[PDB]
Amino acid sequence: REDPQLLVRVRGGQLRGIRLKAPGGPVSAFLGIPFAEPPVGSRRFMPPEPKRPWSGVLDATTFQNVCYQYVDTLYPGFEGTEMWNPNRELSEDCLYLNVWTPYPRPASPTPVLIWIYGGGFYSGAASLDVYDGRFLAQVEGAVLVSMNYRVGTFGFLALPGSREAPGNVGLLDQRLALQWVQENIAAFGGDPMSVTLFGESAGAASVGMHILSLPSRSLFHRAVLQSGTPNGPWATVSAGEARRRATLLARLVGCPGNDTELIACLRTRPAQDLVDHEWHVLPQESIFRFSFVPVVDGDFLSDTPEALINTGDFQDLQVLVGVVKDEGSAFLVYGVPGFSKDNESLISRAQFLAGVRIGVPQASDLAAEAVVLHYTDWLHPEDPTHLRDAMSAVVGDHNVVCPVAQLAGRLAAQGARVYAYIFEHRASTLTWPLWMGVPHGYEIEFIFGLPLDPSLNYTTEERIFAQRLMKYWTNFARTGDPNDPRDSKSPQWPPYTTAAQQYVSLNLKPLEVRRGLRAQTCAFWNRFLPKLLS
Amino acid sequence: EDPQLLVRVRGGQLRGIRLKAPGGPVSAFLGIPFAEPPVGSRRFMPPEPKRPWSGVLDATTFQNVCYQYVDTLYPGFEGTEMWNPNRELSEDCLYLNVWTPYPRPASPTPVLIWIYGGGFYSGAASLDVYDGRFLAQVEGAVLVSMNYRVGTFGFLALPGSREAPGNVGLLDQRLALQWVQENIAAFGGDPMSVTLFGESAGAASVGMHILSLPSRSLFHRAVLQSGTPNGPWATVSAGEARRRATLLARLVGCPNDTELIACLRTRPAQDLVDHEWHVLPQESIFRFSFVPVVDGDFLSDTPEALINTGDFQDLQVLVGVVKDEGSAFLVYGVPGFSKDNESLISRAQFLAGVRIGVPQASDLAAEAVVLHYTDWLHPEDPTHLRDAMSAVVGDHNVVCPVAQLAGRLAAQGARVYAYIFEHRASTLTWPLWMGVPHGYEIEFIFGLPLDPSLNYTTEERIFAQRLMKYWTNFARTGDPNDPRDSKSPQWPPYTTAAQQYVSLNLKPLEVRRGLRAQTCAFWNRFLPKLL
Numbered sequence A: 001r002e003d004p005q006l007l008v009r010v011r012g013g014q015l016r017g018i019r020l021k022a023p024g025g026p027v028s029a030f031l032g033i034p035f036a037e038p039p040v041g042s043r044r045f046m047p048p049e050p051k052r053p054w055s056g057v058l059d060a061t062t063f064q065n066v067c068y069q070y071v072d073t074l075y076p077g078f079e080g081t082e083m084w085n086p087n088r089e090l091s092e093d094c095l096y097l098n099v100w101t102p103y104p105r106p107a108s109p110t111p112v113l114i115w116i117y118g119g120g121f122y123s124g125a126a127s128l129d130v131y132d133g134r135f136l137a138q139v140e141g142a143v144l145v146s147m148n149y150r151v152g153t154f155g156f157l158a159l160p161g162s163r164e165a166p167g168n169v170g171l172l173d174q175r176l177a178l179q180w181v182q183e184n185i186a187a188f189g190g191d192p193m194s195v196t197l198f199g200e201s202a203g204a205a206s207v208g209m210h211i212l213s214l215p216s217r218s219l220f221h222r223a224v225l226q227s228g229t230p231n232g233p234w235a236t237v238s239a240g241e242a243r244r245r246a247t248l249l250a251r252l253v254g255c256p257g258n259d260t261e262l263i264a265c266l267r268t269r270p271a272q273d274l275v276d277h278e279w280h281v282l283p284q285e286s287i288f289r290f291s292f293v294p295v296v297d298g299d300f301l302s303d304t305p306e307a308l309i310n311t312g313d314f315q316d317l318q319v320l321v322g323v324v325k326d327e328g329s330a331f332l333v334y335g336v337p338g339f340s341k342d343n344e345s346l347i348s349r350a351q352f353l354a355g356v357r358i359g360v361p362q363a364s365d366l367a368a369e370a371v372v373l374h375y376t377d378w379l380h381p382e383d384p385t386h387l388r389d390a391m392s393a394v395v396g397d398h399n400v401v402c403p404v405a406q407l408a409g410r411l412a413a414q415g416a417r418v419y420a421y422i423f424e425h426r427a428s429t430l431t432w433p434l435w436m437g438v439p440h441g442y443e444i445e446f447i448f449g450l451p452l453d454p455s456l457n458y459t460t461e462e463r464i465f466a467q468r469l470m471k472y473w474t475n476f477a478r479t480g481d482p483n484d485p486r487d488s489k490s491p492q493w494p495p496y497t498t499a500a501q502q503y504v505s506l507n508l509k510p511l512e513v514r515r516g517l518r519a520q521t522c523a524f525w526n527r528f529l530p531k532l533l534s
Numbered sequence B: 001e002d003p004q005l006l007v008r009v010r011g012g013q014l015r016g017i018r019l020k021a022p023g024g025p026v027s028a029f030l031g032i033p034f035a036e037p038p039v040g041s042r043r044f045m046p047p048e049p050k051r052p053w054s055g056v057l058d059a060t061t062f063q064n065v066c067y068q069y070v071d072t073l074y075p076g077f078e079g080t081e082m083w084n085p086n087r088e089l090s091e092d093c094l095y096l097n098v099w100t101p102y103p104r105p106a107s108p109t110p111v112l113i114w115i116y117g118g119g120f121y122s123g124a125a126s127l128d129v130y131d132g133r134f135l136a137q138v139e140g141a142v143l144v145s146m147n148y149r150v151g152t153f154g155f156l157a158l159p160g161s162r163e164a165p166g167n168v169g170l171l172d173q174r175l176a177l178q179w180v181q182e183n184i185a186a187f188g189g190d191p192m193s194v195t196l197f198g199e200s201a202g203a204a205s206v207g208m209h210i211l212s213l214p215s216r217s218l219f220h221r222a223v224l225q226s227g228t229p230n231g232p233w234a235t236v237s238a239g240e241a242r243r244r245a246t247l248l249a250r251l252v253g254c255p256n257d258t259e260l261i262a263c264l265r266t267r268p269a270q271d272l273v274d275h276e277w278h279v280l281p282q283e284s285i286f287r288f289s290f291v292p293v294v295d296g297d298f299l300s301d302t303p304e305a306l307i308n309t310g311d312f313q314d315l316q317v318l319v320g321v322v323k324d325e326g327s328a329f330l331v332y333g334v335p336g337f338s339k340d341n342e343s344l345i346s347r348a349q350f351l352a353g354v355r356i357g358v359p360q361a362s363d364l365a366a367e368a369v370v371l372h373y374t375d376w377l378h379p380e381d382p383t384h385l386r387d388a389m390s391a392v393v394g395d396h397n398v399v400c401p402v403a404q405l406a407g408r409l410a411a412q413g414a415r416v417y418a419y420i421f422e423h424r425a426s427t428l429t430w431p432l433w434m435g436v437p438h439g440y441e442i443e444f445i446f447g448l449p450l451d452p453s454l455n456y457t458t459e460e461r462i463f464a465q466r467l468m469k470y471w472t473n474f475a476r477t478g479d480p481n482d483p484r485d486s487k488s489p490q491w492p493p494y495t496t497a498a499q500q501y502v503s504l505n506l507k508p509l510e511v512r513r514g515l516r517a518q519t520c521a522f523w524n525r526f527l528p529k530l531l
């Protein structure tokens, strides 16, 4: 007979989980629990349907398939890229979620943290090493949930107004997993009335979209957005632009005239064919743009995220938001001429002006000259190191820092309690070059508590640092406040407000309170640049 | 009869006056005619050289101030009255002044020629702050200053006409320069070492002589203080001068060009000054009605075209700005601002003040300005908005045009030295929030603190001595550095690569790099692209 602590029933049917080892002791894991009917065949591009009950004991001891997606090839064998690549078989049959709980399971209901991965809505998996829930579960006593959701065409290809491809199905997958937690998480000792969404990059943008979409609001109570927002230039597309891209992809794969016929033809296409042409539909040469993303349908998103944050009422809402020191750096090697991970990437002024057009593709001649003039150091306008770093900052500011600044300000102006951070610590184990600093994605391993595994080779200080961070995030999940109530002396993390614009540095040093989140530069992007795009 | 006070110039004999300077005597020759009075039919015309005279011409007093507007915003207040005419007003005002050491220098001495400011609508070489006494006495310099015609009389133009060709006020200055070439040797001045210096409009004038071929054989070096020939206020197009002239003429009941000018010539001087202000195209500050015109003659092209393409290889230039170029202008039109209170303005008042500080700015352009100068951490702080409104006006009109001139001259072979003047005169009567306003360095360059009776601090006296040394070292050699003092900190030339300039204040020279580089990139490269 089996460990009595690993047998659990959901709506659902019977699950068998696995006792996993964490540094401080054991955790329970239920991996690869199906939450939808496999979205395959006639069902590609369609909203997810709830999983039908099964008979017997479903084995929930291993991660399940990763959703069909582009696999990164730019640097073969390189940990810097491979750590984000799929670590299970690619299949369209990928709608599974994972649960980590303390072992034995908690006696009284426990706060639930739901992770939503990033990958620009074209990639990602809940099964990646950096999303391992065992540490938060073992150390903080948290119930941690993560779901696979369809990406790329499978998740976001839309012919807006159609029945067969309405768009945003990837978000609907996420919503279904959240409904699943509501009905079922109490079986694992989680408290459905205390659910905090967190996510990074497109996951952050996803979390933000759940805040902005009414049918999702009853499904969670708090939200954390790491290095991503639902507003900004990459996280959504207009209905018209989504139609354009789906139509073009359709022709690239020999699918010519109503929507039914088109979509039917797309459905007969092999999954890999779609991935192989996914990238060809982008309107300009660009970086930090992705082909198939959330669409402003007038349904899931009733209006543009910009409009919904300017007019929304956010009184009952608590959000932790923030950014890493170098959001843009690692994007630069994916299409700006002159940039590489294998050299120092010192660029010329010409390579900088060309970079700007690629980093801000939307983005008239006048508008680009404004960006260049703003980011030039007029004391040393030809210095290749400053040019390199400005190119990085341009991409980081435009896509993450300033959309986050805008979000924090709007939410705080409209009733929300907002906490804001900038994460500035570079993992000792990073394999990206030094010049990239603290790239997009490299706080995640610290929030999840990876440094606690002695076999990963983080420094002792990093181990203590990760413990601090896990404490902030889960204090926030519990109470809506990252601070410790008992711990008087430790420096306080004040709320971000419009008046004082306070946020904290997260690094090896104790908390330092800073004011204004690149306030001057973000006034350029948020306030000015729109106006010379009229 | 003191033989030291008796000089023969080309047009006849002069008698000067021995004046007292704190260190000892100087010889002054004041009110020397350098032109036929520009009166009657000669109004608006180029100056003619003064006819020779009999006997000994009395040159012991300042002569009339050129006909001009007299300031009436704060009547009897030192801060304004000090720029007002201190002699009788007359159209008969083409005279100049020479201060020389006493006894007259043994060997040929460098000559400094002062060209006053006042927006081309006012000014006079007779003001207390332009007193050449001290430079003559302490440094052994021969100092010259001329009156030149201002407002309508100096710069009313109907371009391409014979009778009002424009720029005659600048021709007045050129004639005084010629007079120096012909006559200064008689005083012990070296006509081969002439340095022009000027402030505000006087600085813009200096720059116009730099950019006009016929003036170039009349001087060797130049100092432009808080003013430039390029930039938004110092010139107007032919088309715009014609419109203002026509408008003025219509405003005074006048009347082809000949006829219109003839009628203008019948009008009493005060009638022209009465309506001078109503020809401006917009509610504005730091804009002046009658200023030099791009005539294709004196100025062959815009100062902007001319500085971009000129050869400046055998030229040495000293340029600079004061710490608060625009503070004092704000009380002359921007709602919210007065000298009698702290002028703590609202945001609304800031956006409205920008439309006035940058009158030529579109809605979008003005937005860019506001967004640039707002402090986004304290977007509604009255003190910040007040200081920023000042900054807008100072950067737009003075600092950034100075930065553009400096870079252009340096790139094109000139030797350039730059400064920022940061000492507020203890005796200043303007309020504290104005900081170091436009015009308040001249005092120190001319050496007034050396007069014990004016109540400057000891520090202030020593500081003015330093400054007089930089200016005269510069006049003497084209280099402001003291060639005897074998200690630092050296004043380095301004260059396009390094962009070095120095702070002039009570502390020793500090070398700084980049003269508001980020901000001036905004004004010099970006803002034009919006238009």
Ligand SMILES: Nc1ccc2c(c1)c(-c1ccccc1)[n+](CCCCCCc1cn(CCNc3c4c(nc5ccccc35)CCCC4)nn1)c1cc(N)ccc21
Pocket: A070, A072, A074, A080, A081, A084, A118, A119, A120, A122, A200, A201, A275, A276, A278, A279, A330, A331, A333, A334, A335, A439, A440, A441, A442
């Ligand atoms: N010749 C081709 C053909 C097809 C595709 C190609 C190129 C590219 C491409 C590759 C290299 C250079 C330019 C373009 N691309 C583009 C891939 C570039 C996308 C950006 C990679 C990136 C870089 N960063 C910042 C650093 N950290 C991360 C990553 C990655 N993922 C994550 C996910 C979450 C958080 C962080 C993180 C993945 C890769 C490396 C770093 N995030 N994402 C395609 C994309 C498709 N969806 C489909 C097909 C193709």
Ligand SMILES: Nc1ccc2c(c1)c(-c1ccccc1)[n+](CCCCCCc1cn(CCNc3c4c(nc5ccccc35)CCCC4)nn1)c1cc(N)ccc21
Pocket: B069, B071, B073, B079, B080, B083, B117, B118, B119, B121, B151, B199, B200, B273, B276, B277, B289, B328, B329, B331, B332, B333, B437, B438, B439, B440
């Ligand atoms: N209602 C009227 C009618 C006619 C005129 C009026 C107003 C004005 C005016 C006065 C107050 C507010 C708005 C408008 N104005 C405007 C004169 C004010 C313009 C500039 C004042 C100024 C302020 N600063 C800075 C501080 N230092 C100086 C000065 C002044 N001159 C100089 C000269 C050289 C160096 C410095 C300097 C003179 C004034 C005060 C300070 N420089 N110049 C007129 C002008 C004309 N040419 C003819 C008519 C009129």
Ligand SMILES: *[C@@H]1O[C@H](CO)[C@@H](O)[C@H](O)[C@H]1NC(C)=O
Pocket: A337, A338, A339, A340, A342, A343, A344, A345, A346, A347
């Ligand atoms: C770095 O390498 C890339 C491609 O291999 C190249 O384009 C770039 O010129 C290199 N940069 C430097 C500074 O050598």
Ligand SMILES: *[C@@H]1O[C@H](CO)[C@@H](O)[C@H](O)[C@H]1NC(C)=O
Pocket: A455, A456, A457
């Ligand atoms: C950590 O360091 C050890 C050497 O003690 C080495 O054997 C191992 O490969 C390293 N682990 C990782 C994940 O880099």
